């Protein structure tokens, strides 16, 4: 019967398809590893796929996956147990160390570029002629931490130019330096910007950017990781 052949054939196709999809999805993070970093004995039934190579634009080179992997950064964590499957506890300040929900990844230390080779993310003052088009303009507002103290003031918005979107607020601290606060982690109110993730004491600790008019992928990760990290790690002073 022809419908029978069709349905039996489709299920064979589907097994094939799932195999292809699962392997494609092992281009990153594999082989699996014991908690001490050695290759795990059990890798499961799907093999790693044949490598593929991405040609990155703007002469930024190439990426081949899968390939040799390492963290390229130290991890201030220690085992809490002899057997596997238990948590690794921070050996220092998890926020400063960039571990747990404060983790960051060693991305390129160059800014993301747009389709024409220009920096994707720019302070609005440098982005011609961008402006706030709707909603409360946060520039000039005091920035409040979860402890309800003022940590600084908003001096600009960093905008994703190709997507025309607010990506960070630039906040000026008491000492006249600035930090970037992720737009996803701030609440713009009528008389203030409120940051739930950080108490005022924690803003100085936000990682700084190397040049004041651009931000690199590495720096975004460190900044984002750190701010998110405060939801778990600044919970002593919160009290939201």
């Amino acid at each position: 019967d022809l419908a029978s052949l069709a349905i039996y054939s489709f299920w064979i196709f589907l097994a094939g398809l799932i195999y292809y999809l699962q392997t494609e999805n092992m281009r990153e993070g594999y082989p699996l590893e014991n908690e001490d970093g050695t290759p795990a004995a059990n890798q499961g039934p799907f093999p790693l796929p044949k490598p593929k190579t991405f040609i990155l634009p703007h002469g930024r080179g190439t990426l081949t996956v899968p390939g040799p992997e390492s963290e390229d950064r130290p991890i201030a964590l220690a085992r809490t147990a002899v057997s596997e499957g238990f948590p690794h506890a921070p050996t220092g300040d998890p926020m400063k160390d960039g571990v747990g929900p404060a983790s960051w990844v060693a991305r390129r230390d160059l800014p993301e570029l747009d389709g024409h080779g220009h920096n994707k993310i720019k302070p609005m003052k440098a982005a011609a002629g961008f402006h706030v088009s709707a909603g409360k303009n946060p520039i000039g507002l005091p920035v409040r931490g979860c402890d309800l103290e003022i940590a600084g003031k908003v001096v600009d918005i960093w905008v994703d130019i190709p997507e025309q979107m607010a990506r960070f607020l630039e906040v000026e601290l008491k000492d006249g330096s600035t930090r970037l606060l992720p737009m996803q982690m701030v609440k713009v109110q009528s008389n203030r910007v409120h940051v739930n993730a950080l108490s005022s004491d924690l803003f100085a600790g936000i990682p700084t950017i190397k040049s004041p008019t651009e931000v690199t992928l590495l720096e975004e990760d460190k900044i984002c990781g750190y701010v998110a990290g405060g939801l778990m790690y600044a919970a002593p002073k919160r009290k939201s």
């Binding site: 019967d1 069709a6 993070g29 990844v105 025309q164 979107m165 996803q184 982690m185 990760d221």
Partner: protein, 302 residues
């Protein structure tokens, strides 16, 4: 509460974005449309530009001819009365030829001929639009994934209105143009074939349709959950994995014991969606040509 990233808190605007050039014939591109602040709370504010070109003109003209052919039939069925037109709008139907006309293009205008004409226009509308999804990708040096995926929807559409009717030997099998009548046709199609719930290709199609909503809810919520680390910037996460993509993967690995990559989730996405109409088309194509009655077939598998 804090920010949930469903709606933006602050919109910013700059010069209209006229887009990448590559091999695009820029003379065929319109200018920007207006900016929609309302849209801008959720997605992008900018409308346009659009690429036109010859294929697009053919496609839009053909598509309008399809629409107007149906609409004039409706005006006719309404006795040219605008009040009747509005009252009975969902009840009007442009129906295919009766079975006795078979595949004949000699069906009377008011008895299936106009359906054939409307159908000719739809056929070229859709196939020229397909050409378009291919050429627009090509002009930009892009892969042809869009045109490939569209082909799966076109397969179901083709099976319903063209392939199945030809294999059955009459246009009367095809779907009529009307709001309610297309529903009645769907109901009736299942009744006449012994209930589509016994068609294993209809059950697959459903698994994939439900699966599509499951997977887009998952992916969409995941990306928004890690948007605080730039997770929506997916192309750069592919080229240079970040903590967004890592936390995304680990949420799922810890939840259900496996996970995707930033690129690979988009392969799960595209296949989940295309499989809806791939399986559906097969299920419909086999109905009446090979299997009269799905209940009966299920009792046998023969």
């Amino acid at each position: 509460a804090e920010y949930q990233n469903i709606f933006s808190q602050v919109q910013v605007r700059g010069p209209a974005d006229l887009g990448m050039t590559e091999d695009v014939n820029l003379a065929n591109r319109s200018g920007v449309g207006p900016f929609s602040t309302l849209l801008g709370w959720f997605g992008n504010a900018q409308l346009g530009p659009i690429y036109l070109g010859s294929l697009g003109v053919l496609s839009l003209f053909s598509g309008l001819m399809w629409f107007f052919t149906i609409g004039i039939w409706f005006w006719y069925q309404a006795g040219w009365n605008p009040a009747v037109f509005l009252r009975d709008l969902f009840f009007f139907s442009l129906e295919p030829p009766a079975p006795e006309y078979g595949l004949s293009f000699a069906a009377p205008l008011k008895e299936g001929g106009l359906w054939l004409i409307a159908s000719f226009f739809m056929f070229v509308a859709v196939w020229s639009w397909w050409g378009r999804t291919y050429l627009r990708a090509q002009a930009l040096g892009m892969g042809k994934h869009t045109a490939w995926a569209f082909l799966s929807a076109i397969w179901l559409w083709m099976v319903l209105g063209f392939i199945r009717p030809i294999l059955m030997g009459s246009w009367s099998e095809a779907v009529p143009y009307g709001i309610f009548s297309h529903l009645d046709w769907t109901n009736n199609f299942s009744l006449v074939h012994g209930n589509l719930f016994y068609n294993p290709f209809h059950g697959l199609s459903i698994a994939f349709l439900y699966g599509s909503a499951l997977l887009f809810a998952m992916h969409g919520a995941t990306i928004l959950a890690v948007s605080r680390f730039g997770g929506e910037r997916e192309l750069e996460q592919i080229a240079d994995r970040g903590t967004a993509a890592e936390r995304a993967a680990l949420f799922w690995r810890w939840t259900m014991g496996f996970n995707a990559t930033m690129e690979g989730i988009h392969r799960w996405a595209i296949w989940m969606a295309v499989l809806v109409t791939l399986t559906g088309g097969i299920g419909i194509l086999l109905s009446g040509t090979v299997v009269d009655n799905w209940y009966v077939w299920g009792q046998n598998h023969g």
